[PDB]
Amino acid sequence: MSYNYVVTAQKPTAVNGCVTGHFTSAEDLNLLIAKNTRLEIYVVTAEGLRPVKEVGMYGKIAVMELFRPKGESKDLLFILTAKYNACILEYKQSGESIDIITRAHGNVQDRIGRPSETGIIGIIDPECRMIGLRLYDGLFKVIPLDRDNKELKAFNIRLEELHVIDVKFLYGCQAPTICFVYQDPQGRHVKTYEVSLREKEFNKGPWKQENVEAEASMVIAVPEPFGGAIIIGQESITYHNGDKYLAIAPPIIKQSTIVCHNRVDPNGSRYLLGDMEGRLFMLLLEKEEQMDGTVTLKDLRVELLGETSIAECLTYLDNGVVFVGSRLGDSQLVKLNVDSNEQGSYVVAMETFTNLGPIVDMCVVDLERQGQGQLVTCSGAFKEGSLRIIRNGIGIHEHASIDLPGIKGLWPLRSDPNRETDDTLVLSFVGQTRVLMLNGEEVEETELMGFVDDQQTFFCGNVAHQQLIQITSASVRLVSQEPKALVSEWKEPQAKNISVASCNSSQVVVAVGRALYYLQIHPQELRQISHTEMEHEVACLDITPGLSPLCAIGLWTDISARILKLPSFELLHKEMLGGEIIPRSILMTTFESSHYLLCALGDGALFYFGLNIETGLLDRKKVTLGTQPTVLRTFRSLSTTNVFACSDRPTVIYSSNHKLVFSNVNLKEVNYMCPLNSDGYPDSLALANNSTLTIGTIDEIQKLHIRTVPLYESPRKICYQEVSQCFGVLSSRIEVQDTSGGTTALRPSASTQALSSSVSSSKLFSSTSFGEEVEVHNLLIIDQHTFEVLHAHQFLQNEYALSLVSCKLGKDPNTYFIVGTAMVYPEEAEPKQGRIVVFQYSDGKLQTVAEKEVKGAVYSMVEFNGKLLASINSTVRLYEWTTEKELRTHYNNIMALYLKTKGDFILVGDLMRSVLLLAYKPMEGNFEEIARDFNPNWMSAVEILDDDNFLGAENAFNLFVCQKDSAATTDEERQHLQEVGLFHLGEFVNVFCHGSLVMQPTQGSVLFGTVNGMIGLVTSLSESWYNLLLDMQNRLNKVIKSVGKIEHSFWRSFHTERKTEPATGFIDGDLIESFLDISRPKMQEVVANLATADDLIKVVEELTRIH
């Protein structure tokens, strides 16, 4: 009876792999970026990186390589899932759309191998003879490459070399030959083998086995003109080819291990290298063209180019530009320049890509303060460590406000020698109209003086021929920019009112009852051109430039999207979309390389269409925004700008990949709006509602607005303290032993350039190498508005902070920052000494209140019921805040890393392996072990849904829920709890916490962050929702196409090295929200028995507004 639900709140942003090649067409420079379950394809264009198609697989991309075999049109992509799903792909844009055909596929797991240190390796032959795998120790797998092997078949060779580091296929050999670095006793070596796919055996390799560096970590396939292999160790870079052998050992390298490499030239004369310190080297193979026209290679030279961010992938694109794929921090784009312009860095940043990095910890705050919170995470490691403030939805920041009561229109107006800055704002009430005169921000209105007084203005703009028009319920009126007086007016033939109004720079389309009149703006005159009465009564008009071929309309009778020319009123189309309530707003504008038609029903729904303008032919989809007539309007932030959707749920339609973005606005309700670039509020927007008249600015192009706070060090834990109006963050930096026997700063990080910056000097202990890297932990008092390191309190040497708490204890009025540490000596791996320290941020100082000496590692701790629950090594103590402010102490026996508290005296502890359930009783101060879990799990996170639902996540990228068993005898069968939920996420969860990003039928909300920068939400479903969506899952696998032909069943299965179970009690909207992206024949194959399309399309539309 545990029915949960997981959605992606943010795609994984870390970059794990990136390759270059010709994938779309021939000479189509593609950049293929691997995130986790996502695959991104780009085309190098003048613009920069422009994508073609972002696909999504049911697996964790572990091997990604490109190649086109003998006689192929374009390169064939190859991908291997970490769960051992192989597939060859092919970009095929034969039609106007894009489809990734799956030429081949096949699972290549071995029932009898052990995954090896340094993980999976996927190598491909230089001439596309075979794919080579190194999944398990001592087993090299071969997959021959022909055409009939479409069901990817494979066979294993045996590898006498047991511990293998890195393998590569050598260029220019008589047949497939392999070069690798393997380890055994007596250091590690490099051996050569020949793969013989005719006898399925290993043959003695081209050259002798050499001894190499002890820490050789990478092998580089050197191209044809030179041939050989380059081996990158920690301190010596060596070149091996037969008897030839070169090697250079620059001390410039040892400081950090080289991690990645990328080939620059096709010749291989130049290579790019990357440090964990964030460097970027250029490895050189200098040439020596001899007498006999041949080329040879003479020496190696490595010289530093500068520093990028810490790179896990590396890739030269084109024109001296390199894409830096960062896993610990922001991926970026980099230009390498011959002239080192500034300092010594030949490296210049061009673009950075938001990477939420390894999310170590996070917390939810109401920084905006309605109901919608913002996530503040601890992203990145080392120099790329930052804080990320995920704000959800387009937001504004108001600059002024005026108590108005019920406006019915907003219009900018310019009434002066044109300064290019609007100086007049004109409002309209149900009848009365008041032309606000605002040289500054004034209230007092002077009707700039011909505009109508109490008749309720429908349009008020700046028409061409340097004049100013006003459409109202009396007449259209032209006030001039020559004497500034009423010079022209179009009364009505029957002398009756105007209903609809539509005006641009030089045209005017008005409507009376059923009639449609056309007017053209000329100096001091209003000219009549067209004239027609429609079939039905006019409800809404739109014209869009100062001359429009088309004129869109909405009628009062049949909800007819009708398009008309203007020099006459010839009908060009009508749509079969008849509702029952009137269309209220209509608009047509240009977003990107297209022309869309928009229409707003009175019920709250909106349609969008596409078309050109040489014929009136037009993409029905009932997108629902608010519940009240949504008044549309175009607005102008930059030049390429979008439309504003005034409603009680203000949406904004931006341009995506030349499609639709629908981002809510963090305001309660808006009825009317218009842009404003004023000589007093420049580039502001005027927002009207039923109350105030705000004025402010705008933020973002899509949903999230991610604020960044660079820390330049590693942030570990985070808390929020409202009484101090500031955050609390624990963080560690790296320091290397100097020539003096102490440490040093690598780079000026945040803790070292803090405002206060105190230290410790606490004698609590009484019972030292050189050239090392030591950690130094601090407590950062980040401020919550002007993120800055107010205070940075430093701990003792060899003391690592591991837990952070911001709470009140006992009946003490003060709110404290409680920090629990652990003494780490670089020798014995389970700490024996620790500390729990209680601080207070009084004003500008960080007082040390109390200090309970502790012997053990304080892994985690949480406020419990005014008591300080703490986890020390294998003991779970319950402390208590003494009136003397001493925190006196109360027992279990278990290694708790993670610790949560529902309340009600019930606890959650993890990790001797599995989960436990403990209860406190006002009885003895001691806990009772209610019911634990026995099947083991190497876990990494914990959370509570309710009293009988406990969320787990373990080192294996799976989720699972525990629940107290209800079996026969409560004597023991209750003393256990089973796993009513199993689920494979593919992400490495680090932290669970409660809250929702949206301001908020389905119960619950738990957010989690992951190493790949992915953010997800967990909810709960009644037994009528779970069984609806469960059968909606087991019917969507049949009607959705998998990129690798990987059955969704297999992807979600609980996978470990031991129990491979099916999923239960879990539902992923990432597989169910996609149901809104299919055709109706398919979409109605899932919904037939047990219910139609319009009864799921708009039900799921509620299930996307949970995150």
Binding site: L29, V44, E47, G48, N337, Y346, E351
Partner: peptide, 19 residues
């Protein structure tokens, strides 16, 4: 001025000159 930065690969020149 770097020696080893003269003449980076150029597959197309109008390929990256907008930014």
């Amino acid at each position: 001025m770097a020696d080893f930065l003269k003449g980076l690969p150029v597959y197309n020149k109008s390929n990256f000159s907008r930014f």
